[PDB]
Amino acid sequence: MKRKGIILAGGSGTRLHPATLAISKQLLPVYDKPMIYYPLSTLMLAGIREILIISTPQDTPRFQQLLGDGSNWGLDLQYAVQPSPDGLAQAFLIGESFIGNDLSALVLGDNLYYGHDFHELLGSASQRQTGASVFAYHVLDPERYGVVEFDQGGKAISLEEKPLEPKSNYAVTGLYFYDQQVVDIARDLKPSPGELEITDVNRAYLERGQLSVEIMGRGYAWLDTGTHDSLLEAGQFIATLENRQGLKVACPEEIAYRQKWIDAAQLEKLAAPLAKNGYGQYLKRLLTETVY
Amino acid sequence: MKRKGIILAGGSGTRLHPATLAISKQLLPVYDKPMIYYPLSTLMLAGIREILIISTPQDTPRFQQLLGDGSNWGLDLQYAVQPSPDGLAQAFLIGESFIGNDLSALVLGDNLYYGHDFHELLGSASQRQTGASVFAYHVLDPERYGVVEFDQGGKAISLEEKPLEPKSNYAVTGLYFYDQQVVDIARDLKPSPRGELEITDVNRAYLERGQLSVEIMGRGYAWLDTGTHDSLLEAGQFIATLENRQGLKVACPEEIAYRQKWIDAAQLEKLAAPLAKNGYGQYLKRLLTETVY
Amino acid sequence: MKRKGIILAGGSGTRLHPATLAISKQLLPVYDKPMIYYPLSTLMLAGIREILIISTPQDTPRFQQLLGDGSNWGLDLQYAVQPSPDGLAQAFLIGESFIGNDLSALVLGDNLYYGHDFHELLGSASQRQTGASVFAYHVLDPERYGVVEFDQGGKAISLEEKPLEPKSNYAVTGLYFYDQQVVDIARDLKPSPGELEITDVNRAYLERGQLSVEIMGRGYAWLDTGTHDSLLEAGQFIATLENRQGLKVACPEEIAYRQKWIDAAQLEKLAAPLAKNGYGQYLKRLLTETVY
Amino acid sequence: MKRKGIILAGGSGTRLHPATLAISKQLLPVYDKPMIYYPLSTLMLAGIREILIISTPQDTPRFQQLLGDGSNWGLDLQYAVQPSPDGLAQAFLIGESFIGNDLSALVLGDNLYYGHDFHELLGSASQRQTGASVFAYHVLDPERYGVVEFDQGGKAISLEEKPLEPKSNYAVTGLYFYDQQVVDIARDLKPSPRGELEITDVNRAYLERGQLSVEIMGRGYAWLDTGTHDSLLEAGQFIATLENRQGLKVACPEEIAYRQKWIDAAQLEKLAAPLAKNGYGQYLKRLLTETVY
Ligand SMILES: CCCCS(=O)(=O)N(C)c1c(N)n(Cc2ccccc2)c(=O)[nH]c1=O
Ligand SMILES: CCCCS(=O)(=O)N(C)c1c(N)n(Cc2ccccc2)c(=O)[nH]c1=O
Ligand SMILES: CCCCS(=O)(=O)N(C)c1c(N)n(Cc2ccccc2)c(=O)[nH]c1=O
Ligand SMILES: CCCCS(=O)(=O)N(C)c1c(N)n(Cc2ccccc2)c(=O)[nH]c1=O
Ligand SMILES: [Cl-]
Ligand SMILES: [Cl-]
Ligand SMILES: [Cl-]
């Protein structure tokens, strides 16, 4: 069945001003590409093609100019705005008619993932046609996120949002898969102590016992881009991987062509406008080179 | 006699595409603040308050949104567009009416400077009220820049642009001081074989007239640019190591304007409030009570 | 059956002098621990307990003081020297009587690995009781390594050592698994144009059609520490992972305790001498915390 | 009148264990060269040629292997051990016969300095032939250091060691100049509550006598230390960005000795050969033909 994807690329507030005064976080580069390329590549990796990008009233035309209607990468892109940063769950209100009758999946515009068999870890998430699937990852600072609590035997029992006293060190990453049940669950939500919390959306699935909570192991890197210090670290992290390997991370053109969403000829047409820099040359090398 | 400044912050073309497809280079951060804060701070260190910012038609409003007219920082900022990226020396045809009969200074919107007595090094560039004054810095890769050539005694004898076999390793920094002759030198230049009004031709004109002062910017200075993705990241790591070590900032324009006495403590306090939550407003607040030597 | 491990921690020559004038590369720290901890942790991860450390005549007592007889981490450590840097295959001459009759495995002292299911990728290597198993990894600069060549259909056909003209971009990592056949193959080896080449040891297995060449995917990081620039990159790479996660990479004490090679009580005894710094505090946290 | 120098490069204890279980801190690299090259270079910048190096009994031979007696670099190096790590001011009881009736200078073997006119800033510290001279640098974390306190006019009025509530953000750098009184001040000190002969007591003695010169090391200077794993890595990224930008090196002792004229071109050429293969020997070779300002 049909599964659609949202990228919530909204306002980081004033938290990183003045770095973000001119233009929103998710259009900043992480090393060699816009930050958005990374969650865009995430959805593409779970095999999602029809995608809704949400952002500030101001930055939406810029995400638009950046991406187009997607048709160039064998994707289908539709855009929507969020008036005020009133919580991540608000993505499910804004995208209701986009979501329609289908299965959905929400990724944060400022979250990076990297690792082996990542395709498969998402592939097994996208496959469950019922309930919701989220990921837990061990971190040093669990307070900054939705913390998940497991019982003596591996089962999820509590989910607290930014708790002052973490129970475990297990944070909920910014990737989520939901069934047809999500939108309605989101309509019945009340503001928190003042946002529509993604964690309530998840605990509503936990109480109905339909939150599947799979561990994303220490062999995976989950980076968020929350501080100037960490945004820097993620640029160094990508830079080291890409220069070591001669291969890119979250290059969508490559992700499309590999999922066979565009033929060798279309990819080449995408290589043309960027032939002079290394980014194009990279796409061009993808026509002749075998990469396992 | 007063000096005006020009920041060139136009189109870097397609070189750093796709990072720069959505916004222009000079809005990307270097650590905790927009890249343009760094050359804007450089002009301020030179005591210059009237600055023209030249960018693309497409990005000009985003610069306006970030920097305004300068009144917040005791400056006056004007804006101009460069529709076609036809080379650096063109900032002088676009900036003509801005410049008038005044002295000027050009800065690249994508160069950072750091180090000791940087202020005094700019003051003596700014005090020479006739001719041009540029700066020479030893680099690894002078192939990429305007290269200077010195005789046995340290007089500059030639300037070449991007030679394959540079005569020295001394590159011309993206900082230039000019008298009133610069506009007329720029109006008379013919397009490079490329079709770019090259600033090295402008400086070369002044050199032929014995009016080019070339001062050495020591290896004790950091002159970084951000010409590649790797070097942008390198420049971010650099500032963060200085700021995290020191609890002082590099190229905080509120602090510098305060330190020039272009704004007072009351105005600084007002500038801090809408940012009191983050480290930056907290940093502007702390400047009010602390003596920093 | 019994499988033993070598760590070849010998001379990098004069390549990184003066940084390495005082003491050999593999005792330099990568971020928070000696470089050797990393290949040591690699062998431990393929379930290897009996290990031979080879190094310069000069640095052997220092590797010794660093590690002891291993008995503290439930390992069994024996030491051996290499007079001159006359090739990596020389490890199989020096360690003959150590190797004895058993299965073996050689890792380079200056190679870092990181990734998900790394235990398993080694577990499937250590398991094949016949022939040799090596890994290929895509890289930008294949010239610096043994390059492997694959045919139109995924099979390894040539192995060239530092070729001037790489065929593929696939380099041989510094992890190798060999059967009882290795030692003898190494005795019959002649010096190259002037070293005993590890690649000849491997091509000898390729000609007998007994080199198993498994792709280590782009989801894995293989770092070597060959330039001052790269040694730096690997320190930043570890630092980012460890500070993000609150978990260490290649902490042997943790690898032992998890493989149950030491009981909660012994680990605690190891936590004592380092209680004041973060490294001990980390071991101490391992007694009470559940890490999936 | 001549000045001797002392580098303290002893046991950092167990703090950076396990990185430092096999070798002492001051042998670890900062980028492309051993950490001790950096303070050794600092002494050389001060014009000091006779250096005592104080390390553990265990590591002393490895320093000897790396640095020798100095003759290669126009210096004379001697060695001494500190069996027990009893604090910095103890370098003066151990170094007594080395010091004699001469002036001295202490440097921490784990501090880096960079920036413009660093040489001249050391010269004026070295020219004051009476009293002590230290340096104050604004930091984020003065809790960790000896903190200076200034009155309204910039005279130093107190010194505190690791206060929980520092009076300023000005920390005392690990660089100190002393006259002949320092040994006698050190012999009379009583163990800190910890049991460490604290250098801040030594400097405090001189302050009480109106003989402490405290000079500001500007924010245009980088004074980095390597007190944590993260900051060691940060200091490596820092040097590499300067050296990779410039094609010049920071704290290359062959270059500095050559530049002081402590060795000549023939001697430099000899020092380059056993390293002609790597970038370092290539860098020593290139110093023979290039003019660097
Ligand atoms: C979007 C974050 C995860 C990217 S990743 O799967 O770990 N990764 C390194 C990666 C991978 N693995 N691949 C290979 C791949 C291509 C298509 C489907 C699955 C895997 C890419 O073409 N681009 C990539 O960035
Ligand atoms: C970005 C322009 C060069 C920066 S700098 O002169 O080296 N520097 C560290 C600096 C300094 N020195 N100062 C202090 C200062 C401010 C105004 C006039 C002289 C000195 C600042 O307020 N901000 C600064 O960024
Ligand atoms: C030795 C390089 C590979 C280390 S790793 O397997 O990727 N890794 C991150 C790691 C892992 N995965 N683990 C968990 C683990 C412990 C024991 C057996 C398998 C896996 C650790 O205890 N320490 C580690 O460093
Ligand atoms: C590590 C001591 C401080 C280094 S420094 O004075 O800022 N500096 C960059 C430096 C400089 N300036 N020089 C040039 C120089 C050498 C000798 C005397 C004056 C200047 C060097 O040869 N090596 C150096 O590391
Ligand atoms: Cl894992
Ligand atoms: Cl200088
Ligand atoms: Cl993979």
Ligand SMILES: [Cl-]
């Ligand atoms: Cl300064």
